[model samples]
Target: IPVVRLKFGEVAEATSVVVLPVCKAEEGEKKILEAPMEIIAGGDFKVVEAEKGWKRWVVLPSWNPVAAIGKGGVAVSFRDRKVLPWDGKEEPLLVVADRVRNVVEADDGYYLVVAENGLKLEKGSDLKAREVKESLGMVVLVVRPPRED
Candidate 1:
């Protein structure tokens, strides 16, 4: 099976749009479900600098999938208000910090906090730099906030 290697700076904004079915092949023509067909969180979103190795094997059933692919979709629009920074109204993709020295944290079930440049994780833990590096390319689906009741 081929690993989905997300490069240094890739972001995918998830929405509620219907996703198309796709299958990916490995070195020996091995095909695997690259990604399941489903809609974005709200049917509209975007991803940035998604890197190579990623492919959408099948086009959306609609005539203009591109327009319905990301935040640019015409039939749908973002209704959530939290993801305005990236012009997103839904969940925004999580991009790694620009520099290696930065810090990354998966606090609770919410945002993966990326510390400022030149920063580092707390000292004494077994987590290594490379471990943090790997998360740079992953996407952030939803930003969960702590429960307050």
Candidate 2:
């Protein structure tokens, strides 16, 4: 499995779909979902709640790194109003296989999801899920693997 962090305006050209963490927003405001809504052709998106926090995975039609120009070209400008900063941390936008196995939570407010070939998806955080069988947090998705001969 591959894990990486992406800047607010960076193009996810390699894959059409990506998963990102949901950060808290200002008081009386909704939590921020990290998809690039400006350039995404369709509005198809899904949000899931984990023990640690919330996450969103959505499809993007196109990305424009300079979209925020003339307003504020910085990454912060791309964020939703009053969204908390993910700086100095592993808050990342993960690109995983279309087929997801399961999503789990770990210590220190981190999440791990399973994908193809036993691939576990997570942020770039130091904390890790204890074990496959003994993992904690909610089981967001589960699929039976193919029978082995």
Candidate 3:
């Protein structure tokens, strides 16, 4: 057994790569936190086959998930905490949206809407009422990091 920290260096365990892209902390901050990160860090994670384009990934803080959305789904990020009126939570999050989904239906949730003004997050109830251009997808999942500050 041993442990040590150098003045200009530090000890660390050998590690493997993570597949999920780091959600990207905004400037003034620091950072996937993929399954590998999830596994080594602890336990409990699902393993899905890497698809043709394993979906899209992006940090939602002032990000545009629609930019690279062609066929596969895309990922978006949220910094540590915000006014998540839809869910009412206090923490950072990662969101993934799909290109192929139910556009003809709406539920009690926030929706990715393509409107005349541009992309907007509209409530499902209000979304169906106004009948905007399209409803890209529902909030598939609201994710948080494995650790807390």
Identify the leading candidate in terms of TM-score: 3
Residue runs of model 1 more than 4 Å from their true location after superposition: 1-16, 20-131, 142-149
Q: Put down candidate 2 lDDT per residue, 1-149, tens digits, no spaces.
A: 22223333345453343232322212111222222223222345533223343243333222332221111011111112234665454332322221121233333333333334222334423334334432212222221222335
lDDT of each: 0.25, 0.27, 0.39
lDDT of 2 at 80: 21
Selected candidate, larger TM-score, 2 vs 3: 3
RMSD of each: 17.0, 16.5, 14.3
lDDT tens digits by residue: candidate 1, 39-142: 34322344332222445422222222232334211111112345347673543221111112223443321112223422122321223433542221112221
Our model 1 lands, by Cα RMSD against the true structure, at: 17.0
lDDT tens readout by residue for model 3, 1-149: 01111111111231222233323323111112221111111334524334333233332221233223334344445454456657766655555554355363655666555434333446777876776535655544444554534
Q: TM-scores of the models, in the given order?
A: 0.17, 0.19, 0.40
Tell me the lDDT of model 3 at 110.
Answer: 67
lDDT comparing candidate 1 with the true structure: 0.25
User: How many backbone clashes are present in model 2?
Assistant: 0
